[PDB]
């Protein structure tokens, strides 16, 4: 229970203030968990950060596997519903930036090397499924030919950038632009 | 005013560490300027941030006016040399993140409301000049057919996103992807 309570409280804090500007002290009084009880689950603030990331990429990559493997859907449909998921998981007007590549990639220089290695890996793992799914649509005729490596990265950048700007402006506008653009570049 | 030194040290701390994470005191440690010289010149750490923000958009928007107003260049050439400038000023392997929009817009939930409106206005400023130049690109036949407002948002987002991933990875790759996409979108 309390391990997970710390992890969920780690995420909510992480979504608003990042990881490196946040004392363990802050995490602790936000979780309402005592210090002693923290060191029973995690060796460190740094290791608690790894756990959070690790946990974050697993849930995220698994959802992407489920979706990009959904029977009865072509590669266009599988891919589109992932972008829709992004557009619908975002709340422009909430303080929480739930997309950590966006949150943490902006703060990467003040992170440890281990955290940076995990963040690039998680991030490479998203692009890679995007490439897979693009390549798969060329096989079932669902998507017009393209350089799939190039397209995947182009699309991911576009959406990261819209996440970033959506949060600045507390507005849905930039994610709508990302979607509209994604429809044009595809089909 | 040899305390441009301070605004340049402020910009060198900002590029690496962000703003809210780093203490009012620490800025003076890494500059060689005692606190008296500081309070001479600034009423608070929040006001030190504003100047820095304001003077960053001054120099930045005054640079775009130059190039989008440059005589003997068509719309494409002016526009293209803006993207080319972003590609060339980006240092992937450098710890320094020079676009403050990426740097600070990712951490915006943890900034003063006044810093955020300055960030929103700066960014609207950039977008807005892109609209202009797109709009003078369909007048002279330099640019591929598009809605200007939509294309400007799309391109600014793609480039914000590329800057994120360039810094995560320490690779020029993501910026090269953004340029190729922009050439395809526009030439």
DSSP letters spanning A10-56: HHHHHHHH-STT--HHHHHHHHT--HHHHTTT-S-HHHHHHHHHHHH
The tally of domains found in chain A comes to 1
Largest CA distance in chain B: 58
The torsion angles phi and psi of A149, rounded to 5 degrees, stand at -60, -50
For A16, how many CA atoms within 13 A lie in the half-sphere containing its CB? 14
Residue B154 contacts A, CB cutoff 8 Å? yes
Q: Are B179 and B163 in contact (CB under 8 A)?
A: no
- Burial class for A174, CB neighbours closer than 10 Å (0-12, 13-18, 19+): buried
Q: What is the dihedral of CA B42, B48, B53, B59, to 10 degrees?
A: 40
DSSP, residue by residue, A58-110: HHHHHHHHHHHT-TT--HHHHHHHHHHHHHHH--TTSS----HHHHHHTTGGG
What b/e readout covers B27-62, taking b as 16+ CB neighbours within 10 angstroms? bbeebebeeeebeeebeeeeebbeebbeebbeeeee
Q: Are A109 and B166 in contact (CB under 8 A)?
A: no
What is the domain-level CATH number for residue A103? 1.10.357.10
For A41, the domain range is 1-187
Resolution in A: 2.4
Largest CA distance in chain A: 58
Q: Are B167 and A105 in contact (CB under 8 A)?
A: yes
Alpha carbons A138 and A187: distance in angstroms, whole number:
11
Ramachandran class of B147: left when φ > 0, alpha when ψ lies in -120 to 50, beta otherwise: beta
Contacts of A46 (CB under 8 A, 6+ apart): A112, A114, A115
Q: How close does chain B come to A127, measured CA to CA in Å?
A: 11
Contacts of A132 (CB under 8 A, 6+ apart): A68
* Number of H-type helices and E-type strands within chain B: 9, 0
Determination method here? X-ray
Q: Are B43 and B8 in contact (CB under 8 A)?
A: no
Q: Are B113 and A95 in contact (CB under 8 A)?
A: no
Q: Are B150 and B74 in contact (CB under 8 A)?
A: no
Q: A-chain residues within 8 Å CB-CB of B107?
A: 17-18, 21, 106-107
The three-class DSSP label of residue B72 is coil
Alpha carbons B35 and B172: distance in angstroms, whole number:
40
Of the candidates A54, A46, A42, the one whose C-alpha atom is nearest the C-alpha of residue A20 is A46
Contacts of B19 (CB under 8 A, 6+ apart): B49, B104, B107, B111, B115
Secondary structure string (H, E, C) spanning B5-33: HHHHHHHHHHHHHCCCCCCHHHHHHCCCC
Q: Are A64 and A79 in contact (CB under 8 A)?
A: no
Of the candidates B49, B163, B48, B55, the one whose C-alpha atom is nearest the C-alpha of residue B103 is B163
What b/e readout covers B123-134, taking b as 16+ CB neighbours within 10 angstroms? beebbebbebbb
Partner residue opposite A109 with nearest CB, options B95, B105, B107: B95
DSSP, residue by residue, B34-51: -HHHHHHH-S-HHHHHHH
Contacts of B139 (CB under 8 A, 6+ apart): B75
The 8-class DSSP code of residue B108 comes to G
Of the candidates A159, A184, A89, A124, the one whose C-alpha atom is nearest the C-alpha of residue B157 is A159
B122, B154, B186, best to mutate vs chain A, most A CBs in 10 Å: B154
Q: B-chain residues within 8 Å CB-CB of A117?
A: none
Alpha carbons A42 and B37: distance in angstroms, whole number:
44
Alpha carbons B13 and A184: distance in angstroms, whole number:
40
Alpha carbons B171 and A170: distance in angstroms, whole number:
30
């Amino acid at each position: 229970d309390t391990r997970q309570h710390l992890l969920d409280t780690g995420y909510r804090i992480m979504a608003v203030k990042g990881f490196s500007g946040v004392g363990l002290n802050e995490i602790l009084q936000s979780a309402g968990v005592p210090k002693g009880s923290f060191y029973h689950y995690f060796k460190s603030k740094e290791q608690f950060g790894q756990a959070l990331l690790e946990d974050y990429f697993r849930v995220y990559l698994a959802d992407m596997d489920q979706r990009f493997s959904a029977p009865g859907l072509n590669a266009r449909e599988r891919l589109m519903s992932y972008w829709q998921k992004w557009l619908d998981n975002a709340c422009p007007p909430c303080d929480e930036q739930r997309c950590l590549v966006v949150k943490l990639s902006a703060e990467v220089a003040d992170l440890s090397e281990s955290m940076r290695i995990t963040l690039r890996d998680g991030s490479d793992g998203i692009i890679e499924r995007l490439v897979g799914c693009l390549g798969q649509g060329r096989d079932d005729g669902s998507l017009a030919p393209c350089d799939a490596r190039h397209m995947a990265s182009a699309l991911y950048q576009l959406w990261l950038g819209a996440s970033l700007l959506s949060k600045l402006h507390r507005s849905p506008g930039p994610l709508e632009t990302a979607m509209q653009t994604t429809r044009s570049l595809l089909e």
